[PDB]
Amino acid sequence: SFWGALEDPARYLVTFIAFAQIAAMVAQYFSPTVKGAVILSLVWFLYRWKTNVITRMLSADREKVLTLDKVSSVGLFAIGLMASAEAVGGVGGVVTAFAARDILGNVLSGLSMQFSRPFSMGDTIKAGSVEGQVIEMGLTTTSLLNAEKFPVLVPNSLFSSQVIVNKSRAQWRAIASKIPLQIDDLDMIPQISNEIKEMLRSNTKVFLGKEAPHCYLSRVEKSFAELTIGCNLIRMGKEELYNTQQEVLLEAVKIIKKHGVSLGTT
Amino acid sequence: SFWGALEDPARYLVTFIAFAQIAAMVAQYFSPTVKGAVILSLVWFLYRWKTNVITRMLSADREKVLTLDKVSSVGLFAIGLMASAEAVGGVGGVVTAFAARDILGNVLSGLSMQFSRPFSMGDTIKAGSVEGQVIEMGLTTTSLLNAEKFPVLVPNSLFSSQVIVNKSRAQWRAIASKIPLQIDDLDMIPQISNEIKEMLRSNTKVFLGKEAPHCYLSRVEKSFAELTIGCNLIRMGKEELYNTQQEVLLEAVKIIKKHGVSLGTT
Amino acid sequence: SFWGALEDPARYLVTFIAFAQIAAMVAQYFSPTVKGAVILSLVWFLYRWKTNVITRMLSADREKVLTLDKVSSVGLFAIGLMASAEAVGGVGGVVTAFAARDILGNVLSGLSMQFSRPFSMGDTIKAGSVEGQVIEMGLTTTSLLNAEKFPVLVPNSLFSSQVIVNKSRAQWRAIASKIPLQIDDLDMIPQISNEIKEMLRSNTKVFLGKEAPHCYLSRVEKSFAELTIGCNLIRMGKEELYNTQQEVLLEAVKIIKKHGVSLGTT
Amino acid sequence: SFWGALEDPARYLVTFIAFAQIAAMVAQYFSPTVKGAVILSLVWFLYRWKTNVITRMLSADREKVLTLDKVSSVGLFAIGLMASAEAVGGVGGVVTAFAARDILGNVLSGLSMQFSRPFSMGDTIKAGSVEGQVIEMGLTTTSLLNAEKFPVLVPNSLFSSQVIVNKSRAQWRAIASKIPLQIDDLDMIPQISNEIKEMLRSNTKVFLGKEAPHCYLSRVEKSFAELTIGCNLIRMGKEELYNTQQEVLLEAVKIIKKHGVSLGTT
Amino acid sequence: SFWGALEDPARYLVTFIAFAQIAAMVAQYFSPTVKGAVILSLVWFLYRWKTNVITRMLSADREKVLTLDKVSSVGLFAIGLMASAEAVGGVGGVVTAFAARDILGNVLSGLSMQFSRPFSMGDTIKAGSVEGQVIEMGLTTTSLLNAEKFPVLVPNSLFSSQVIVNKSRAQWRAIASKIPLQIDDLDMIPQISNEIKEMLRSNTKVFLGKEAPHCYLSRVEKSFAELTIGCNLIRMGKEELYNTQQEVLLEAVKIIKKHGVSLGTT
Amino acid sequence: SFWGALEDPARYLVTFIAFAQIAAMVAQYFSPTVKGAVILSLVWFLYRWKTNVITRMLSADREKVLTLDKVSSVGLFAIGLMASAEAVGGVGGVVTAFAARDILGNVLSGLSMQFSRPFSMGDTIKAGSVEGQVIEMGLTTTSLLNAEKFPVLVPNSLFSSQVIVNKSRAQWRAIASKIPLQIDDLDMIPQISNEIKEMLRSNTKVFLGKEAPHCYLSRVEKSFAELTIGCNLIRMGKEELYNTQQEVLLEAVKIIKKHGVSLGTT
Amino acid sequence: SFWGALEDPARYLVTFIAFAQIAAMVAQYFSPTVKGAVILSLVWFLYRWKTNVITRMLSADREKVLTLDKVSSVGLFAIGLMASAEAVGGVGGVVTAFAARDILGNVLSGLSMQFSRPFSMGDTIKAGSVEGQVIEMGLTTTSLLNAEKFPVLVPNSLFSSQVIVNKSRAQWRAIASKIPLQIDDLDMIPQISNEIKEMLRSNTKVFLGKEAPHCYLSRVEKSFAELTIGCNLIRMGKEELYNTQQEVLLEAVKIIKKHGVSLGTT
Ligand SMILES: CCCCCCCCCCCC
Ligand SMILES: CCCCCCCCCCCC
Ligand SMILES: CCCCCCCCCCCC
Ligand SMILES: CCCCCCCCCCCC
Ligand SMILES: CCCCCCCCCCCC
Ligand SMILES: CCCCCCCCCCCC
Ligand SMILES: CCCCCCCCCCCC
């Protein structure tokens, strides 16, 4: 524990200065480099000692310990580098470019979504890869609840120039289905279709505003046919939707078997 | 609530200045950094207090609250930074580059689509990933209505150099189908085909301007054949299209079974 | 309507100047910022009033209204910004770079396709994702007619360094097919094949210039075999092509069943 | 026709100068901007008149018309801009960068393929997405003939650092096949395999230079086995290849059924 | 061993200086280039000798050997280059850009995840490609335990602007299933469904807070139907979840077979 | 032939100077532009005449013709441009950047593969998309022979930082297989497995150095089981490998049927 | 051989200087360009002669020949260019950028993996596309042994910021399986499951530290059910793992058939 934590940086530092001595045999900056190497080996030893004593205390007010010794590790590394500067290289523009891009892109999208609102709290959305309910609109991250009701954490910058499908602002819904038929004489196929269309227009909870309900014949085969049925239902909840799907399917099968035509197999 | 909101930034700030005191033991900028740290801890405390009192009022004129305390959070952060400047780093060119790209790319595409019009209001389009009716042509976003009649919100810059299929400007439509046959003697296969082609040319609602209707034999098997049938119908609505598909399929099956040939199974 | 359109920017502007007053407590540019904020709130109010009165007139010479109030919205925003300049940020190089790229890339490809012609009007082409007839070669966009006879609008810059298959310049066509066989004694398999090859060489509408017609045995199984048949037909229209495919398939099946060999099932 | 072509740019130009008059109420460059707007409206009117009179003549020496009025459109736009300069923005470096990249990349690859020759005229190649015979090696574009004998037009820069499979320089070919077996007693499986290998070595048109012919047992099942057979044939034409495949398959099936073992089904 | 290690760089160096002598026949920098070539051949010989004597000792305190002779190889290369400088090219900005990007991006994301916590130790997360339990939150790398309980090592910069699904913060779970039915008379289909919904509401361990339990008819066929059943269960462990899934499925099948309806086959 | 080759550039040039005359009505550089236009029309005429007389000679020492008139076309274009310079735009840095990248990247990788050798002549390699034997290691391109024995031409820069699987340096091979079983009483399943493992250890040509041979039960079903069998064979040729696979499979089936257990079907 | 090697560059050079003579008719740099062209034609002739005499000696101490005439080719090209300089263009920064990126990225990752060790010699790892045992950790390349025991050669820079799954540091393993059931009365389904869970807890070689063993019902069908069984086994070798999988599966099937329930078919 303490043995190797003092052993390995010390032997590494004496190996380094023994290399630097013969490097000075053949850049005459000897004393500042050995002072920097001494303090940097000291800070490497202190870092190893610190992670050893924090894993000693974790073998016996929990998250505070982790954030504390993490910021203490980065601060001890910083004070080691500012002790090496006593006796920047150009990374600063790169890391402020990256941090400015990430943080300010997130807050910029978080405000542009606040002006030109693409959704509200409770809406079910789909934005590219993510999909679910909106449970928390935050400053840098939105929180969704996906199809398995797990909380997803989406950064705002993923809503910047993407398409957003808003499933909770629809005013009518489109439903469709296919019904296979075991019918040998297709001369009854028009009438049935017309009957099914009448069933879809005398029915409430359907929306005849834009598209008429359809029921047509999509493919044929030996002792086989297939009807494609579809309509627009009015705006309704997710339980009435399922009940209306089942009710429409059952009424269509009642009409089909009323004409003495059994169902087919796929 | 108020306890931790005053507790955590204060203990963090005294931890920070206690670190800075021993940082001054080994950059002699002490008093401005402690004044900036004091005001920044004050603004962190005020931010935590503000989100606590807005979630206190939300536990008892709704969207205005959310946009108000969001712009108040970003303004309180701004006034904290301009209090730190009293006692920019280069992010400004990056964020104006990003915002200029997003906003002006959207308005540029929104005008170039206004000059050289690729669609109009009500047209059914497909542009890459999106597809549906055009219900609102806006300044920065177009609004579509997809196949399930959900409102999609597309930014204009996604129409810049993409292919746009406009399904509402077609002047004729191409339909096709396959019919399986249970036929053992294929010597009747030409005549049937010719008959079906005659059915597709004496029929109205077909368009003989460019391509002749076809009905050929695509594959063969034991007690099995397959006809590929196709034609161009004239410009018509979406109900006449389905009825003409069903009518053409039924007439083709009438012709096939007229020659004493039953349908096959796949 | 008029209530909120005057209400929300006015209350937002007095909130902003009330923030700026305490911002001046702790940048001494007070009067120009309040004059700019006043005129920008005025232009936000005028924008909201203008969209309200255009949606008032749309609730009672249609496309002209939309292009007119769109260019009026962008011109009112421009005159608001040039009133703020009375009392550019660097976006101009970015937007002229983007617009120059889009517009001049389209016109550059539209001329390079005019010199070194890869297709003409009426040709059926395939260029990556798009495929169909060429119905309009324009200055910035080509117009195609796809397989469902919908007009596709392709920008010219998508033909810059892509492969272009030109299906209307072919001088011969390659056809092929597979025929399954229910044959138990394969000693008749060579002769049949030779017979089929003779059928493909005494036939007109085939092209013996480059490749001889082939008919070989690709796979075998219990009571099963498979022949792969293929040839090159001469340059012909799309109806003669289908009729020649059907004729070749029927002649091959006549030859196969002439040797007392029935077809197989897959 | 002439009505709207004079009507819309004139009303647009008087709308523009009426906007500019109140723009001069609150940049004192009035007379040059109104002179530029006048000439640019004049050139927009002339462009609309020119496309109207060319579509009038096309409603009554064809390709020359299209290239002529296209270069006349771009020259009329150029002379309009050089009339606006009488009373560049930086696009020139961008468009010469793009044109230099495209044109000189094509001619550079067209010469590097001429020095270090990866194929010749008539060779069947495959280079990434494209595949077929080489019918025309040009200065900027190669021309291939694909598997359906359509002429493909490939730019030379697509052969720059890609892998090129040259199917016409092979000196031997590798063939392989699988034969299913309905065999219950697998003790005859070695001998058969050895027999098949002898069939593949006493046969001419095979190449025993590098790899010995193989025939091994790849998988087993109830009343089922599978032999994998393979060899290298000598360099030959595409008809001898198919005949040798069929001959080898028939000889292998003769050997298998000689041992009183029938074929299996998959 | 020693033979070739002295042989090949020596013959290469005399080949090089013999080339340089005739290079000086037709840049008059002879003596520094031959001194640099001499020392660089010497360092190539020493590198080959060193890897030979370390692979000699590895053919007879293990990881220390590997890190030691690796840093000795790179230090011997460094001292060879600093001997060539006695008698930088611009790579330094590139490698500090790359190293600054990698290291500081990892530590930046490692701190931003420490402030705005997306998960804690023990949580099951999914972040793009990776998924599993969180067993070690480190300074530069997080450690997960995937579905096969292998330790995955993820760099922190992969959590920067990605969506993070946190499966351990869910407060209710959504379960669903499909049940096929062999039913010929569908008039019993509503009642059964209602019964199943009652079973899902009188049951404990379900969560009726947001969505009602559903059981509807999704598709129909000959002697076939399909019920889609679903509900929200309360927050529970991974064993109670499986037992509740099995219990709900068994109760649904008891209700279905109670009405004299057998199950169907797919 | 000669008619249009003199006709079209002459009429184009008089159209151009007639445009330039009215361009001089409203840049006073008249005489140099008309002299450049005259010589450039002359060089366009000479280019058309040259391709006509080379396609005249190709309608009657073949590859030399093509490389000769290609370099003559590019040299005639060069001498036309250097005649226009008598009475560079910045493309040179771009094309030398591109050519330097391509050529020197290929030669750089061709030397780095020569130092740190990843394969030799005759080795079977797989490097990303390419796979086959190495038949020619060149200066700028490697040549492989793929699985169908076609020569592939790979540029060296595709081996720069990719993974290279070298199938010809393996010292042992791993083989595995699955055997389905029709067994109803699984109490014989251990013994059989142990027997099969003994068969794989008393066998020569297997390698017991690292992994023991395994034979375990992977899945079960009605009248069905599945054994997964695997071992490491010693280094051997590609014929002994196939014979050892067949021999091991036959011995395993002998052991399985020795216990009175038949094979199963999938 | 020698004929064309002297013939083609000489005729090319006299063609070039004959072009340059008429180029001097209309840049007065004649004598240096003809001297450079003379020496460059001489070096092209010497290159062709050298590859001819090395392919002459290869038609009669092998790898040394190839590396020798390759470095001799590049040195002869270098001495030709330095003879042209007697009577750089800017490629040097590009090629040192590329070489510095490749070489120093590999050595940088090779040291960062040596400090913060993600695996050791002998560990089975998976890092993106590659997977296998670690047989050689080198300075610039790691060597793996994949699933077919082929040596893979991975550059170190592919381990820089990727996820590394280390399959040899696991302390317990997760196993799971599915068992289909032919059961008509599901009232025995709980008890069986409980029995199976007891079998998985009284068993040694399982790890009850974190997750309890589970056995639940995942899906149901006519005369069909499916159990999902799973547990965590303790750390063990790859043979004990397979034997424990088989043993657990056999014990589960013994428990299932003990209750008078046969297995089902999928
Ligand atoms: C102070 C912490 C915020 C910085 C985080 C930004 C992350 C940037 C690095 C990721 C890409 C290089
Ligand atoms: C004032 C709000 C508009 C700015 C939005 C632009 C978003 C830019 C960031 C996204 C990419 C970095
Ligand atoms: C005047 C309109 C033309 C400009 C359109 C160019 C679009 C550029 C923006 C798209 C990408 C940022
Ligand atoms: C003179 C015509 C040649 C120029 C064509 C180059 C096309 C460049 C634009 C495409 C990408 C922006
Ligand atoms: C002298 C010929 C060599 C140059 C070839 C380089 C090709 C560069 C162009 C491809 C990409 C733009
Ligand atoms: C001295 C050899 C080392 C250089 C190799 C680097 C390869 C760089 C070229 C690849 C990409 C352009
Ligand atoms: C001192 C070691 C740290 C440097 C590692 C950084 C790796 C950079 C190279 C990878 C991409 C070029």
Numbering used by the authors:
A (entry chain E), B (entry chain F), C (entry chain G), D (entry chain A), E (entry chain D), F (entry chain B), ...: 204 to 229, 236 to 269, 276 to 302, 313 to 491
The paper states:
MSL1, predicted to contain five transmembrane helices and localized to the inner membranes of mitochondria, is involved in the regulation of membrane potential and maintenance of redox homeostasis under abiotic stress. When heterologously expressed in giant E. coli spheroplasts, MSL1 displays stretch-activated gating in excised patches and channel properties similar to those of E. coli MscS (EcMscS), which demonstrates that MSL1 forms a functional mechanosensitive channel. The overall architecture and domain organization of the heptameric AtMSL1 channel resemble those of the EcMscS channel. Akin to TM3 in EcMscS, the innermost helix TM5 is kinked such that TM5a lines the pore and TM5b runs tangentially to the central pore axis and connects to the middle and C-terminal domains, which are located in the mitochondrial matrix.
